[PDB]
Structure 1
Amino acid sequence: SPSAPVAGKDFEVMKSPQPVSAPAGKVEVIEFFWYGCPHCYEFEPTIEAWVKKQGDKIAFKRVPVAFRDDFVPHSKLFYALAALGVSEKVTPAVFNAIHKEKNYLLTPQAQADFLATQGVDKKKFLDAYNSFSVQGQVKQSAELLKNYNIDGVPTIVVQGKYKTGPAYTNSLEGTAQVLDFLVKQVQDKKL
C-alpha cells in the first residue's frame, strides 16, 4: 500500500468518464494502440496473457489509433481483419512485418499483398477494407480518441474512468501492474 500506484502519477482519473460497455460484474478494459508503435508491439504478449488470465472477469477491447492521415489505413486494417474473423491468426505477422521486416503496410494493396502470404484472400480483404461497416468503425475509433482524451499509445483505460500506460509509469511492466491494481480496486468497489 505504500507501494500502491499513485493516483495522478501512475494513472489518471478522467474528468469526464465514459459509458462502460460491459454488464455489471465485468470490468471494462480498453487498449488504445497503433500497430506501428514499438511499445504497443512489445506489450502484446504481456497484455494478451493478462487478458486471457482474467477470463470472464473483464470485457477487453482494443481500439486502433491513427495520429495522422497516413496511418488511417492501419485502423482500416484492424477492423478489416476483425470483419474477416482472422485477427487472432494474422496479427502477430502484421506486427512482425512492420517492426522486423520494416514493411509499414501503408496502403490497402500493400496489406492485401502481405496478408495473401498469410492465407487471406485478397479480394475478401479489400472488400472488407473498403466496406461501409469498416469505414464506420474507423470514424468511430477517431471519435473515441477524442472522447477518452488519448494522446499517446499504448493507453489502457479501466472502467471508462482510469487511464494508464507507459507515459504514466515509464515501464511496460509498471503499466501491467497498474492495470491489474485498477481492475481489482474496481472489483472491490474501492474505485
Structure 2
Amino acid sequence: AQYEDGKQYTTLEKPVAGAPQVLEFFSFFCPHCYQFEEVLHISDNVKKKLPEGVKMTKYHVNFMGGDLGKDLTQAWAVAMALGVEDKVTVPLFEGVQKTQTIRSASDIRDVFINAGIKGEEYDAAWNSFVVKSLVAQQEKAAADVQLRGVPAMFVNGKYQLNPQGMDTSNMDVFVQQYADTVKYLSEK
C-alpha cells in the first residue's frame, strides 16, 4: 500500500481504550522535540490538516532530566490549567536546551513570570489539586502506551507515528508527510 504498518506508523499490539484522539508526548530536555517545536512546528501543521471536530492533546514526560524533568511536567500541567501553553513553550525549550538558564523549579517559574503570568497565579496553580490530577493524567497516558521515547504521537490510542520511516532530506516535505499520515490514521 502507500501507508503501511511498520513504515510511517506502527500498531500498538495493546490498544488503549478511550484515549485522546491525537496524543503527543514530549520533553523540554528532548532534542528532537526542540526541533519538532521550533523548527518544524509539527503540532501546528498536524492541526492544520486534521478534520473538523478532532481534539489535540500534548503532554510532558518525566523520564528525562530527573528532578527537573518532573518539575517540568508539573509546570506543563500549570501551563495547561492556565491556558498559557503558547507563551511558555518556546522559552522553556530555549531555557533548557539553548541558553541553559533553567536549572531549578525557580528558574522554570521565572519563565512564566516573564511571559506575564502573575507570581501569585503561578504559585497558586503550581500547588493546586487541579494541577496534581493534570500531572496524573500526563503520567497515566504515558503509562498506558509503553512510553520510553519522545517525541511520540499516538492516534486514537491505536497507532504510533514512525518518523524514522519518512524522508528527511527536505524539512517541509517531512512535516507534510508526517501531518498527512496523522490525517490518514485519523480517518482509519
TM interval, shorter chain, is 0.7 to 0.9
Q: Displacement of 1:86 after TM fit?
A: 1.5
Give secondary structure in 1 for the equivalent of 2:79. helix
Q: Displacement of 1:186 after TM fit?
A: 4.1
Give secondary structure in 1 for the equivalent of 2:154. strand
- The CA distance in 2 between the partners of 1:186 and 1:65, in whole Å, is 24
Specify which structure has the bigger relative contact order, considering alpha-carbon pairs within 8 angstroms and separated by 6 or more residues: 2
> CA 1:86/1:178 → structure 2, altered by over 3 Å: closer, same or farther?
closer
**Which whole-Å deviations, capped at 9, do the CAs of 1:108-141 have from their partners, x for residues lacking one?**
x222223222212112112111211111121222
The TM-score, its normalising length taken from structure 1, stands at 0.80
Contact 2:81–2:125 at 8 Å: present in 1 too?
Answer: yes
**Which whole-Å deviations, capped at 9, do the CAs of 1:80-122 have from their partners, x for residues lacking one?**
0121222122322222222221123541x22222322221211
Q: Displacement of 1:57 after TM fit?
A: 4.7
- The CA distance in 2 between the partners of 1:176 and 1:31, in whole Å, is 17
Aligned pairs for 1:15-26 (under 5 A) are 15-20=13-18
Aligned to 1:155: 152
Contact 2:49–2:183 at 8 Å: present in 1 too?
Answer: no
Contact 2:46–2:182 at 8 Å: present in 1 too?
Answer: no
Aligned pairs for 1:24-173 (under 5 A) are 28-44=21-37, 45-54=41-50, 56-67=52-63, 69-70=66-67, 71-107=69-105, 109-166=106-163, 171=168
Contact 2:22–2:156 at 8 Å: present in 1 too?
Answer: yes
Say how many residue pairs are matched: 180
Q: Displacement of 1:156 after TM fit?
A: 0.6
Moved over 6 A (4+): none
**Sequence identity (%):** 26
Give secondary structure in 1 for the equivalent of 2:13. coil
> CA 1:91/1:55 → structure 2, altered by over 3 Å: closer, same or farther?
farther
> CA 1:52/1:182 → structure 2, altered by over 3 Å: closer, same or farther?
closer
Contact 2:23–2:154 at 8 Å: present in 1 too?
Answer: yes
The TM-score, its normalising length taken from structure 2, stands at 0.81
> CA 1:131/1:170 → structure 2, altered by over 3 Å: closer, same or farther?
farther
- The CA distance in 1 between the partners of 2:22 and 2:119, in whole Å, is 33
Give the RMSD, CA atoms, in angstroms.
2.5
Contact 1:165–1:175 at 8 Å: present in 2 too?
Answer: no
Give secondary structure in 2 for the equivalent of 1:151. coil
